[PDB]
Structures are given as structure tokens and as C-alpha cells.
Design a protein around this ligand. Structure first.
Ligand code: GTP
Ligand code: GTP
Ligand code: GDP
Ligand code: GDP
Ligand code: MG
Ligand code: MG
Lengths: 440, 440, 430, 440
């Protein structure tokens, strides 16, 4: 059991979800028509974690595809493995959010969520034991940010004990594919930091950086950006679906990743990713993969860990590796990066092993790292939001829907408090000398 | 008739267990089905098993062993394993959701449901058992289940069964190599419970045993499964006296008298000595006098406490095979004469020797040489303090910050419990020096 | 035996019956010429419940098709399985009620009913043991409401002990396919509440909502709406016609659905109904169907059970299911819906198991629920009726047929008492 | 010659009956036609059947059993069944119209027509019988027929047959799981009649037995047919002593002396102990001393009353198979010593033991293991009070509102008959505590 309900909310979310549910159907051997054509019996021992066995031995994703735009349905239906998702589970508005948190949270989205909950409740009650939820939504756009947060707020009021995991695409200043991103994202994090157990911040900038450097793609498309997110998304929740030499799960990661309740933003990354030309040369060994996973480059977040200092990390190694060798590497990493690891809370790195690798690979890794570097990416959104909010630019749309200036202030406040806290975890290391402080 | 109930709690417990029951099954000649093949035209190894296996009366032998996990994955592996038909379905007890490295979940929230079912199983097994010797228990004190539920069991067992000895083989986290960040918190809360309810607690730090594999078995990349096989051999060598015939017989009851001087000092170490790769077995004499010296080697200790800092309060040498009591006598006499090996004053004769004619079995696929002599030395050492000081220091860094407490507090544990525990372990490391102090 | 005499009164009633007697024919295997062509001998063991065996091994429905319009006969003949019904049983006038309760009750209908009673008596006396009747009419139209109530009054005076079950289409404010609906319906319920043992209120609005949402039909017709009503109509009386792990019948449901005599309005709902596209994905398990049957969407009445609190409910599960698993689900539901179940009278849900499923299905459920929500649908009719009666609008027609204003006031007075009594047993705490 | 008349009243009565007569037919070797095949060239099982079946003189054996229902459907299922040619057409009595869960219909309106025909059938069956032992009766007290007519039968039988024992196996409605809403009303009105006219009443709550199937037989989805099979095995084991030869023989007349101390206290529980799925039979010793412990388990009780609240007033252990009296002696002695099991003071020796050599029969398609030992414990416990108080509480919620009375009153039961019944059951639960009170 330990089942996971997936909600893919807002265009971005649905497209990530589309690729994700392809990735997981490969590892479990499910074919686009919902039949099992896997060779190993290990592929169907724990399937129930993601799929709810339908009649006639079809497998159906426990996905709730929500948007305020009816066009997206056509897109997720167009995709290969589009026939996997349950029609009933598709819930779509008509107008759309129009990149407006308010439209997706207070007015248009506020009418739809009631319908969505009734699906969420239905799929959650089916599970004998619910591990929790994996919400996949953009903070940048309205629907994903507006509804996404409103739903998250709703589900948490109904299912407090159940983990709330979120794979969210934060808006990057480099890309800036929308103007009002800073507003959406600022009002989002306020709702996320209160109602999300563990939020895995993803950034398009970084994902593009992984595609032009780590991999060498001539034309990285949002498909190829989604494929990296989906690879990681599997990694985070594998030791549920397969055996391990040392088992873990979502709650186990949370307990060891979140020291204090508010600092629950993490930088996901995937270690065995190599340029197709550069494969020959690269030797696939635990040390090699450990080097890449702790390279700032590998991280799917804009902020380089180097500026921050890891409060903790977690690795989820795949395939057949000697646990001793892993443990040797995790130790070795912590002695090297003396500065990039917090003084208090020693043996910062956690390690999980799962026996089953990802398809077409011998070994792999998935990395989840709570740093004070993640602060930096949130400062970018703050600086930008402030600059708009100094003048009350674009503010008449949000105010139009019925949101009040008070909200916009509290959102900034609440995000500033987060930013102060992550910086504070460098002041508790600043303990150093008890007689006098290092600044003089 | 020399019956021993084995309680395997938590992943580390169960997986160690699997390796134990492979060895036992081979030793007595039980096949995976659970039917010994009736050969030699006489019951020659008849009643040897009645230590570890109850006859069902139909020609099927079942292990007297409760495997307990709050997580389903590890116990499932046993159910979909070679030994599926060996273990009694009911004896394999499963939980739906794991403790997730949180003592509190295991001791209050989740545990309190399952323990009720577990005790009922232990009662059913103890009814079959006529003149039970003791409860062997296997729990990780780094992990939730083994810390939490494993501590809750022992408490409950202590009231119900009373006198019946409780020998606890506990996988305390090595200081250099730690798998989880929240381990110190678990271990300390576990140790306080353990400190009052177990009779003798044998300490085994993975890292130490990992080093032994790299040193003695000459494996560059040891696994847990390689580690578990060495743990088994120890357990086998301890209980041996019961199962097989010997010159100088010991019993699980005897250790409790000869190894624990004072009630609170029941922590030990262990060192199985002729750990030799077949590659270097060619070039070694492997005389009793060598095996003994190899036992007291600081390195060959399976917990990473260097006993040269401490004083040996009591040793329990357990030999197996082509062993002559005269040969042993000299071996101990030379150790008593050595300087490096130092004994407390108040213990004038510390050694308890146990000689079994049965040699140790060579497990196929097993990283060991078939050898004609052996010894398992459980040693009460003042050095044990060192491990407890390092788990106290590593905890005192925490709980200054109130680091991970929110989790523990949320799941029922009052904050003050943490403070109580650290105060009782500090009281232990006071005692350990006090006994170490030469007599006034 | 335990035979059931069906009366399908008024256009709406005759069209429901047409579809009903097609649905029951498929289950029992009877072909449109009255010949048995079924493959299972279980199909004919209890056929006598609904059909009377005529000469030559033809099966005839025990249906009395009454209407004041002669055009309806053509409609029920036209239908496939239109040759099943007995030409002596068809009793039709000439003029028609004209959507007037009065014309269908006090004048035109008052002349016909004496002819119908003679057919009712005939078919009722043929049965060795009559379970009762299943009247299918509309409260909205003049014929179904006027004659239907007048017949129901008559049959009850002759046959008190015998169960009087009614599947009545109440007029919905959304549809409003007639103007004088409020008058007809208000005068109907007055007669129904005194003379009907168990009334299963149906609403077109709800049936359309099941057709656009639960099912996904591009063009739901009155054929499709009738098909849903019929599907349920089978379910209510199956454990008569087939074996069961736990048996029930009409009187058993009544004994456990009606705490106090006046509270005999129920909401019927069929569980295994699914959109054709969504079928692949949906898993057909006792829990899944139990979730749909208690969904306020699934009910064939306008009023959501969420507003009321179930005085009681009954499920009539079909196919081969473990009785334990059913019982687990019914218990699970009652804990969940702690508010939507009355405090007094615990273990509110009744359960019945029938081994034989409906055709082309593995499991099914039919739901019958006495809630205090049903009052909300009657308030709509009252609010509407009052507004008309404040002014005495359209009243001259009804007054013209020889009905007095006193009757219109007593009908409103008696319907308000019903609404007061449900609200009592909602608000009540014990 | 050990003749027992079996009266099956109501659906629950008949369907339990079917399962009973399957088992009996298999036990004695009677085929569905009713003709035993004359094998072993000797009448070896000759006169075994005379308990339950009457030889017609032509080689055909007929069950001594009246199946009675006011509904035709259940009895028709027997007539169009495998055992159509076994049961006497007149013995299978039908009604046209059911009681419809209304005691009043079953006790006055409908019941008074049919009861006249049933008594004639019983008289005809009693005339054939020479030294009849007792009247086994099977009725559901939740349902109309079993409550109403089943009560009326017992009243009439008690005047006609006088001394002949009437052991009633009654299916009282479980409190959590109820099939019908009007069940309390029926039960209470039935109990008052049952409280005077029955000698011993063995209570069986469905839910309790459902739980046993999920726990012991490990069936996720139990049916009534699976349940009815366990009920049969109990009845078989109780009447066994008559049918098959034993060391320590019991009789239906003996229980009435040994189990009922005071006239009104005739209510009992039951527990058949070795209920084991063949899957877990492999791994179980199944000695006598286990079977006994497994009988007194609070869970294995077939009525859902936890006897740990009450005090056992008298126990009737009925062993079957490879059972030695010495082994039984130790098993009881250890139970007497136990704390959890508590006996009333005024009963110094509360055990009646009954050992048969005949082992129980494994029904084909039957959820049970072939087992060489068994026991059916019928126990008189002060705990029974708990079930009655719940049915009283559940009844008193009604009749405050006069909730469903209009039905019962319409059908000839005066309203004061409800008030009477509750007052008499209120007088019972007074008695049950009074006897539970330690001697003054
Ligand atoms: N010898 C050995 N030790 C193990 C093994 N797996 C884990 N451990 C030890 O146990 C610790 C992790 O605890 P687990 O056993 O996973 O935890 P648990 O007690 O089962 O509780 P949960 O994690 O909540 O399921 C590690 O730090 C190791 O010291 C194994 O296979 N063999
Ligand atoms: N063991 C068992 N109990 C049953 C079965 N069917 C019904 N029951 C019990 O009987 C109750 C329902 O009453 P019925 O036996 O149907 O009623 P009846 O005595 O036949 O009388 P009517 O309902 O008037 O036909 C349930 O609550 C159960 O406790 C069955 O197949 N097996
Ligand atoms: N990684 C990724 N990001 C996307 C994709 N599509 C849109 N986005 C990002 O999402 C942001 C806007 O969110 P979107 O969901 O499109 O708008 P919404 O529908 O109003 O929430 C933009 O800044 C895009 O960079 C995609 O397929 N993959
Ligand atoms: N469900 C359903 N309702 C109908 C059908 N035909 C008519 N009605 C309803 O019945 C009401 C009028 O009753 P009708 O039977 O046409 O008039 P009558 O013949 O005078 O009783 C209208 O409000 C319609 O909504 C039908 O085929 N199906
Ligand atoms: Mg675990
Ligand atoms: Mg019945």
C-alpha cells in the first residue's frame, strides 16, 4: 500500500505530469493502453503505490489533472500514454486564470476546486493507507499557482497527517516568460510554506543549464526539461515501489530533510545524466555519480549551494552497489565541503539504497538538499516583486478579482521571514567562538 | 529443552535475521521447505534444532522467530523469498506505514497498534517452549521501528515473562559513518528504555564490521548482506553450546551472571576471531593461541570501541571445533600476562571459557574460509563508555537548537523525555568511569 | 407467488411502463412475442411475480395501462415489446385530462376508473398471493395525477393489507414543462400520503443531471430518462424474482424504510451507471458502487441528501459479492456521514443481497433512502403553488370541474404538515 | 437411540441448516440421493447416522429435520438443490408471504397459520424417534420468521414435549454490523419468549465470526456460506459424542445440567479453536494445550462478547481426534491458573470435558485445514450481559420516539408488549451482575 495520489495542476503541471506518467509506466512496464507487458514480476509487486488496478487488468494512474483552461486536456490526450488517465479524473474550467493568482485562487478557481476535492476525496479513500500527495504545479502562472495553493490549503485541512509533497517550477529571472510571475510566486510561497510538508523547487533556467552543459542537446524543448524533472520525481519515491538494502519513503526523507517546519524547500537533482558523446569515457561508479550529484551544476535550482550551507541532504542510490562504498563516499563528501555543511547537526547526509535501477542504466542517484542557498532564488522573486509593488503596477487585475493590498504585503512579509530564517542557519554556525563573535 | 525465541524488529533486525536463519537451517540440516531429509538411518542431529526450530509433528520444522516491521517492504522480501515456506505466516507481522526514523511514532503513534498483536504471537511461541532459556532480540537503534517499537516490546516483555533473560543484539550507529541525520535522537531515547529492560546488550557498529570485511575478507566493496553473515556466525557461536554437544558447556542464562557485574553495566562488545578469506587460509596455522590473540585485537572488535582505553570487567570466550582445554588455558594465561590487555582490579578472574566440539559451518556464497577452530568473545569493557560519549556529544549539538524535535513532539513524545534520556545516559557514563576507578 | 400488479397511468406512466416491461423482459428472457428464449432456468422460476402465463406458453405482463387520451395506446403499441400487453388490460378514454387534476379525478376520470377497477380486481384475483401493486404515474400531468390518485384511493379501500408502491415523477422547477404543475402535484400528494404505503419520488431534473454528468449522453431523450427509472424499478423488487444470500421483498423494505406512516417518500438511485468512455478506468467493486449510490448526484430526486439527514436507507446489491464486504461498506458509510444519519435509530442502513446480476453486468446496486432532504423538493412545489393560489390563478378550470377552494386549502395544509414532520425528525436529537 | 430433531426457522436458520446437512451427509457417508454406499463389506458406520438420519427401511436415509420459512425463496433453493432427493417434501414447509422483519407477523398474523402444520410434522418425526435426546433449533433473532414464528414454535413445543431438551443456536445481531434497522425490536421481543422456553441458548453474532474468517482463514472477502460452514463444524462437534465413539462421552441432556446454574442464565457463547487455513497449518504444532488456549482467546469467541470483562460460570470443552485425557488435564489446569481467564467464586470446578476419537471432517470447497485434533467450548460467561445491554441501549433509542411501532401494533402486538419485554431483559442484566457478585 503506502499509495500516492498525484495532482498535476496548471498547464506546466499537466505537461510535467504527462512526461512523469510515461517515465513511471516504463519502470513498472505498463503499456499506453494500460496493459502490463513487463518481463520482471518485481515491476507489479508495489504498482498500487501509483496505479489503481481497474477491471479487465487495466492499470490507471491515481492522477488528478486540474486546470482552468480546457485546451490542456487536448494536450495530455495528444501525448503518448495519454489514454492512461481516467476521464472522470480530468477536471477542467473554461475561461482560464490569465496568469492571475487571484483569478485561480479567489474567483474562477474558487468555483472549480469544490468539484476537484470530490475527486481527490474519492481517490484518497480508495487507498487502504495513503502515504500522501505529490502536487506538480508552476508558482509562475495563475492556474498552477492559484488553484494549486488553494487545493493544497484544502487537502491539508482534510488530511493533516498525510504528507504533502510539491514539485513546483519557481519563475527564474533569466527566462521570465511572463511579466506578472513575481506577483503569482510571492502570493504562492505564503500559502505553500504554511500547507506544504516538503516542496521541491525546480527552475527552467537550471534545467536549460543541465541541457546545454551536463547533457549536450542542440535543441532542448520543454519535453526534455520535463524528462529531467520526471526522472528525479521517480527517484524521490522509489524505495516505496521496489526493494532496497536500506529502505526509505517520503515521510522518512521529510523527517531527515526538514530540521524546523518552515525550512522545507529543497534542490532536486539526478546524477547519472551524461552527454551522449561523453558516455564511452565516463566510468559509472558510486564515486563518479557522487561527484556529479554534489556539483552545483547538476541542481535543478538557480541558486548554487556554494553560497548557502547544507542544513542536510539526502541521496537515493539505485541499482546494485556496496552500501559500504556509498557510506565511504557520503563521509568523504562531508570532510571536503567543511564550509558547505552546517556545524551543528553532524553526519548531515542521509543515504537510501534501492536494489532496482532505472531502465537502461546499471546505477543512478537522486539528490534532495535543504540548503540556505535556496534563499538566494527567493530573494530574486522578492527584489522583482518589491520593484513592481513600490508602484502598485499590474495590481488592478488581482484587486479586480477581490484580493486586497493587505494580502500582497503579508505575502512579501511571510517570504521575507523565510529568507531571514535560512540566513539565521549561518548565524547558529557563527557560534564558532563562545568568548566573542568573528565580526570585529 | 534449550528453546530460544528470536524477535526481529526493524529492517536491520529482519535482514540480520534472514542471514541468521540461513546459517541455522544449514547447521541443523533443515531445507527451505522446512523438512530435514531423514538420512544416516538414525536421528543423529535429532533435538539439536529444538533450540531454534519447533517440530510441527508432520515432519515440518518452523523457526521460533517473530519478524516485526512497521514497514511492509522488508517482511514482503522474506514472504517472496527462498524461505517463504519456512517461517509461519502469522510469525511474519507487518505494519502499513513506517516509523520513518522517529522513535516517537514507534513508541506511541504506530507501535501501540501492532505490539498488542506481537505479544500474542510471543505468548503462543512461549506456550510451545518448555523451559525457555531466553529471548534473543535484533533491533537497529539508528532506525525508528527498531528504536521505538523494539524498546516498547522489551518493556512489555519484562513485565509479562519476568525472569526469562533478554539478550539484545543492537546495531548502534558508528560515529564516522551514519546512514540517517536524526540517528543520535533515536539511539539515546532507545538506550534509556534498553538500559532497564534488557539483561545483556551486545553492541555492533556497522562501520567497525565494514572495516573487518575490508581487512580480513579482503573485499574492496562490502555490502550489508556480507555484514549480516558475520553477525549470524557470532549469534550461532553464542547459542552453539545449547544446540551441539561440548566439553565445557555454556548457556544464555550463564552470560547474565558472568558478564554483568552491576545491573546498569549490561552493555558489551563482540569479536569472532578466525574471519579469514580462503585466499589467506592457505598460509595460516590457525592454532587456538592465535585465535585467542586475534579475538583481543582492538581492530577485530565488531563495535568500534578501542578497548585499550578501557579495562575488561569480564570476558566470555566461546570456542568451537578442534579445541583442547589445555591449549585454551595457556592462551588465556598469556593474555592475562600481556600489558595492552588490562583488567579492572575488583575482577581477579574475569574469563568464562566455553568449548564446543562442533566446528562453524561454511555458508555457500559466504565470505569466509571453512576453519576447524573458532571463538566468539563477548567482553564487558569500560571502553564502551567511549561510544556513549560520542552519541552524547553528537546529540548535545542538537537539542541546543531544538533541531528536529518538532517531529518527535508532534507524534506524542513530551519534549522533557529527550532531557530525561540525556540525563540518564550522562549518569551511565558517570557509572562506567566509577567502576573503572581502582578499588579504595 | 408474491405477485405484483403494475398500473401505468397517464402518458408519462405509460412511457415509463413501456421501457420497464422491456427491461424486465430482458432479465426474464421473454421475447417481444411473449415466447421464452432465455438460456438460464433461473429466469422462469419466479416469472409469475410480474407475468401471468397465458395459453400456448405465451407470457403476458400483469399491466393495466390506463389513460384518458386514446393517442397513448398507439405509442405503447408502436414500442418494441408493445405486443406483450393484454388488449383487455388497455383502458383508454377519448377527451383527456388537459393537465387538470380535477378533470382526471372528479369528472372525466371519475367515469373511467369504474371500468379500470374491474380489470384491477380481475388481475388481482388471478394471483394466489398478491404482494401488492406498483403504480407508475406523474404527479404533474392531469391523467397520471387525477386518475392515478383516484385509483390508488379505490384499490386501497378494497385491498388495505396489500402493499401500495408508487414510482411518481414529481414536477421539477428547472424543467417546468407545464404551467399548472404546482396545482396538480399539491392535490396529488394529499391523496398519495393517505393511500400510498411507499412512494419513490422521481424528478426529470435529476434524471437529466445523471445523463449529462454520471453518464455522458450528447442527446438524453425521455427514452434514456425512462431507462434509468426502469433499471431502479427492477432493483426495488428483484429478491422476489431471484435467489439471494440475504432475501428481501416490498413489505420488508417498507417495514425498515418507514419509521412513521406519513414518512414514506424515498429517493431511488442506481449505482453501477458509468459514462461509456470512463468504463476502462472505473473498477467494479462493492466499495466503488457504495460510493456512487450515496453520492447526492446519483439520486433521481432534486433535493441533495446533504441538506437532510437519512431517517433510514436500503441497498439491494446484485451479482456475487461477499456479504461481509457489503456489511463492512454499509458500516463504513454510517461512521463517515455522522451528521447525515439521524442520532436515534442507529444502524440506519438496511442491506439486501440478490445472487443474479442485471444483464451485461457483474455487480450492481439499487438505493432507496427515506431522508428529511425530500421535504426540500416539496417546499419548491408549495412555494410555487402558494404564489398561484394567493391570486386564484388558473383556479376556474379546477373549480369548473366541480372542485371547491376548500380542497385547494386542505391539500396545501396537508403538504405543509408533511414538510413540518420531516423537519421535526431532522432537527430532533435522541 | 441418540435421536436429535433439527428445526431450521427463517432464512438464516435454513441456510445454516443446508451447511449442517452437507457436513452430516459427508460425516456418515450419505450421498445426495440419501443412500449410503455399502462399503468395507461390514456396517462399520452403522447406527452412527440414527442421531440425525432415519433409515426408511429401503436403504434411503432421511434427515430428522423440519425446514420452516414464511418465505418460499430459501426453501425453494433447497428443493432445486443437490440435496433435493435427501429431504422429505413435507419436512420442507413453505409460506406464501414473509414476516418482513416484523416479530408481530411471525408471532400472530402469518405464524399462527403455519405453526399448526409444523407441530404435526415434529410429532410424526418424534413418533419415529425412540429415546429422543433433544430439539436443536436454528433461528435468526434479527429477522421476522426466526424471531416471531421461531419463538411461537418453542412455546408450543415446551407444552407438547415437556422434558425433551431444546438447545437453540441463535444468530443475534452484532452491534457494529447490522443488516436491518428494525433488528433491535425483533431481538428484544424474541429474547423474552426465548428466555423462558429454551433450556440452553448458544449465541452467535455474524460480525464476530466474519472477523474469525479474516483472521484465521485469512479470507479478505468472507460470505455467509463460509460462515455457515464454521457454524456447522461447531454443531457437529457438540452432537459428535452421540454419533461417534469416544473415551469421555457427553450428551445434549448433560450440557443443560453442567452449563446452566440458575434457570434464566441459559445464554452461552461458543469457540471452535483449530480454525486454520491449510496455508498456515503447515507451520502449526496443533497440540491439545495450544487448541485449549486458542479456545479461551477473546477473539476466537463466535459471539462478539469479550469474556475478560465477565467471569466464566461454567465451560464445556468438547475435544475431537488424537486427544489424550492426561494432555487435556494439564491444559485445563494451566487455564485455571491463568489470570486473564477468571472464574466465579460459587463455581469451584467449572469444566465439563468431552473427548471423542473421531476427528473432524474436511468439507471439499471448505475454508479449513484437515486437523487431527479439535475442541468446541460452549461457555456460560457473565460477559454475555454486555451484548444484551447494547441491544437494550440500541432498543431504548427507539420506543422513546415510538420509532417503528405502528407496524408491530397494526399486526396484532399490543404496545405494552414492547415495554414488558424491555422490563424483563432489564431484569436479566440485573440477574447477570447479581450472580457475577462474589459470595457474601
Ligand atoms: N547489519 C545491518 N544493519 C542495517 C541494515 N539496514 C539498516 N541497518 C542499520 O539500521 C539503521 C537504519 O535503520 P532501519 O533498520 O532502516 O530502521 P527501522 O528500525 O527499521 O525503522 P524505520 O526506518 O522507521 O523502518 C542503519 O543506520 C544501520 O545501522 C542491514 O541490512 N544490516
Ligand atoms: N449465518 C447466517 N446468518 C444469516 C444469513 N442470512 C441472514 N442471516 C441472519 O439473519 C438476519 C436477517 O434475518 P432473516 O434470517 O433474513 O429473517 P427470517 O427469520 O428469515 O425472516 P424474514 O426476514 O421475515 O423472511 C441477519 O441480520 C443475520 O444475522 C445467512 O446466510 N447466514
Ligand atoms: N519546465 C516546464 N515549465 C513550463 C512548461 N510550460 C510552461 N512552463 C513555465 O510555467 C510558467 C507559467 O505557468 P503556466 O502553468 O504556463 O501558466 P498557468 O497555466 O497560468 O499556471 C512559465 O514561466 C513557464 O516557464 C513546461 O512544459 N515545462
Ligand atoms: N421521465 C419522463 N417524464 C415524462 C415523460 N413524458 C412526460 N413526462 C412528464 O410528465 C408531466 C406531464 O404528465 P403527462 O403524463 O404528459 O400528462 P398526463 O398524461 O395528463 O398525466 C410533464 O411535466 C413531463 O415532464 C417521459 O417519457 N419520461
Ligand atoms: Mg524500515
Ligand atoms: Mg427471510
Amino acid at each position: 500500500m503506502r499509495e500516492i495520489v498525484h495532482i498535476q495542476g496548471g498547464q506546466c503541471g499537466n505537461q510535467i505530469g504527462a512526461k512523469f506518467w510515461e517515465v513511471i509506466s516504463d519502470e513498472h512496464g505498463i503499456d499506453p493502453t494500460g496493459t502490463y507487458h513487463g518481463d520482471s514480476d518485481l515491476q507489479l509487486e508495489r504498482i498500487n503505490v501509483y496505479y489503481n488496478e481497474a477491471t479487465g487488468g487495466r492499470y490507471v494512474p491515481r492522477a488528478i489533472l486540474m486546470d482552468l483552461e480546457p485546451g490542456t486536456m487536448d494536450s495530455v490526450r495528444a501525448g503518448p500514454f495519454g489514454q492512461l488517465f481516467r476521464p472522470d479524473n480530468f477536471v477542467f474550467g473554461q475561461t482560464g486564470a490569465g496568469n492571475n493568482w487571484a483569478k485561480g485562487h479567489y474567483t474562477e478557481g474558487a468555483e472549480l476546486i469544490d468539484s476537484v476535492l470530490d475527486v481527490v476525496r474519492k481517490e484518497a479513500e480508495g487507498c487502504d493507507c495513503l502515504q500522501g500527495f505529490q502536487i506538480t504545479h508552476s508558482l509562475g502562472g495563475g492556474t498552477g499557482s492559484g488553484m494549486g495553493t488553494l487545493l493544497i490549503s484544502k487537502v491539508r485541512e482534510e488530511y493533516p497527517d498525510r504528507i504533502m509533497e510539491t514539485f513546483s517550477v519557481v519563475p527564474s529571472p533569466k527566462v521570465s516568460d511572463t511579466v506578472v510571475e513575481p506577483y503569482n510566486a510571492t502570493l504562492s510561497v505564503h500559502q505553500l510554506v504554511e500547507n506544504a510538508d516538503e516542496c521541491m523547487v525546480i527552475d527552467n533556467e537550471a534545467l536549460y543549464d543541465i541541457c546545454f552543459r551536463t547533457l549536450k542537446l542542440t535543441t532542448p524543448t520543454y519535453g526534455d526539461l520535463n524528462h529531467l524533472v520526471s526522472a528525479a520525481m521517480s527517484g524521490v519515491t522509489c524505495c516505496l515501489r521496489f526493494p532496497g538494502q536500506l529502505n526509505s519513503d517520503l515521510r522518512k526523507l521529510a523527517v531527515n530533510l526538514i530540521p524546523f517546519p518552515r525550512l522545507h524547500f529543497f534542490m532536486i537533482g539526478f546524477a547519472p545524466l551524461t552527454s551522449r558523446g561523453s558516455q564511452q569515457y565516463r566510468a559509472l561508479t558510486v564515486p563518479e555519480l557522487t561527484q556529479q550529484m554534489f556539483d552545483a551544476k547538476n541542481m535543478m535550482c538557480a541558486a548554487d549551494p556554494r553560497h548557502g550551507r547544507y542544513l542536510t541532504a539526502s541521496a537515493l542510490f539505485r541499482g546494485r552497489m556496496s552500501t559500504k562504498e556509498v557510506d565511504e563516499q557520503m563521509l568523504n563528501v562531508q570532510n571536503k565541503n567543511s564550509s558547505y555543511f552546517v556545524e551543528w547537526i553532524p553526519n548531515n547526509i542521509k543515504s537510501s539504497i534501492c536494489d532496482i535501477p532505472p531502465k537502461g542504466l546499471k546505477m543512478a542517484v537522486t539528490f534532495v538538499g535543504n540548503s540556505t542557498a535556496i534563499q538566494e532564488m527567493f530573494k530574486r522573486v522578492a527584489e522583482q516583486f518589491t520593484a513592481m509593488f513600490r508602484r502598485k503596477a499590474f495590481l488592478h487585475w488581482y484587486t479586480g478579482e477581490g484580493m486586497d493590498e493587505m494580502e500582497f504585503t503579508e505575502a512579501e512579509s511571510n517570504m521575507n521571514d523565510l529568507v531571514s530564517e535560512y540566513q539565521q542557519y549561518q548565524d547558529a554556525t557563527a557560534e564558532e567562538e563562545g568568548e566573542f563573535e568573528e565580526e570585529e | 529443552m534449550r528453546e530460544v525465541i528470536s524477535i526481529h524488529v526493524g529492517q536491520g533486525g529482519i535482514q540480520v535475521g534472514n542471514a541468521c536463519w540461513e546459517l541455522f537451517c544449514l547447521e541443523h540440516g533443515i531445507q527451505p521447505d522446512g523438512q530435514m531429509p531423514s538420512d544416516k538411518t538414525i536421528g543423529g542431529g535429532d533435538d539439536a534444532f529444538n533450540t531454534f526450530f519447533s517440530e510441527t509433528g508432520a515432519g515440518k520444522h518452523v523457526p521460533r522467530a517473530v519478524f516485526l516491521d512497521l514497514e511492509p517492504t522488508v517482511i514482503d522480501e522474506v514472504r517472496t523469498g527462498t524461505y517463504r515456506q519456512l517461517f509461519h505466516p502469522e510469525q511474519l507481522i507487518s505494519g502499513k506505514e513506517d516509523a520513518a526514523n522517529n522513535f516517537a511514532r514507534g513508541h506511541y503513534t504506530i507501535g501501540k497498534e501492532i505490539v498488542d498483536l506481537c505479544l500474542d504471537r510471543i505468548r503462543k511461541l512461549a506456550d510451545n517452549c518448555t523451559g525457555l532459556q531466553g529471548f534473543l532480540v535484533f533491533n537497529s537503534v539508528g532506525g525508528g521501528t527498531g528504536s521505538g517499537l523494539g524498546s516498547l516490546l522489551l518493556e512489555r516483555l519484562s513485565v509479562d515473562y519476568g525472569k526469562k533473560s533478554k539478550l539484545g543484539f543492537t546495531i548502534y550507529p558508528s560515529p564516522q559513518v551514519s546512514t540517517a541525520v536524526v540517528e543520535p535522537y533515536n539511539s539515546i531515547l532507545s538506550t534509556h528504555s534498553l538500559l532497564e529492560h534488557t539483561d545483556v546488550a551486545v553492541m555492533l557498529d556497522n562501520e567497525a564490521i565494514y572495516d573487518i570485511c575490508r581487512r580480513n575478507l579482503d573485499i574492496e566493496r562490502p555490502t550489508y548482506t556480507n555484514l549480516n553473515r558475520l553477525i549470524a556466525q557470532v549469534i550461532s557461536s553464542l547459542t552453539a553450546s545449547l544446540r551441539f554437544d561440548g566439553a565445557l558447556n555454556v548457556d544464555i542464562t550463564e552470560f547474565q551472571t558472568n558478564l554483568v557485574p552491576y545491573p546498569r553495566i549490561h552493555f558489551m562488545l563482540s569479536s569472532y576471531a578466525p574471519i579469514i578469506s580462503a585466499e589467506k587460509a592457505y598460509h595460516e596455522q590457525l592454532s587456538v593461541a592465535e585465535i585467542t590473540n586475534s579475538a583481543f585485537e582492538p581492530a577485530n572488535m565488531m563495535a568500534k570501541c578501542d578497548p585499550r582505553h578501557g579495562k575488561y570487567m569480564a570476558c566470555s570466550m566461546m570456542y568451537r571445533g578442534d579445541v583442547v582445554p589445555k591449549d585454551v588455558n595457556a592462551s588465556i594465561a598469556t593474555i592475562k600476562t600481556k600489558r595492552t590487555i588490562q583488567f579492572v582490579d575488583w575482577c581477579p578472574t574475569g574469563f568464562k571459557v566455553g568449548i564446543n566440539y562442533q566446528p562453524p559451518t561454511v555458508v555457500p556464497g559466504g565470505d569466509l574460509a571453512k576453519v576447524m577452530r573458532a571463538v566468539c568473545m563477548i567482553s564487558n569493557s569500560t571502553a564502551i563508555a567511549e561510544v556513549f560519549s560520542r552519541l552524547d556529544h553528537k546529540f548535545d549539538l542538537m537539542y541546543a537548537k531544538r533541531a528536529f524535535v518538532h517531529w518527535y513532539v508532534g507524534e506524542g513524545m513530551e519534549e522533557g523525555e529527550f532531557s530525561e534520556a540525556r540525563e540518564d545516559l550522562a549518569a551511565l557514563e558517570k557509572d562506567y568511569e566509577e567502576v573503572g576507578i581502582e578499588t579504595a
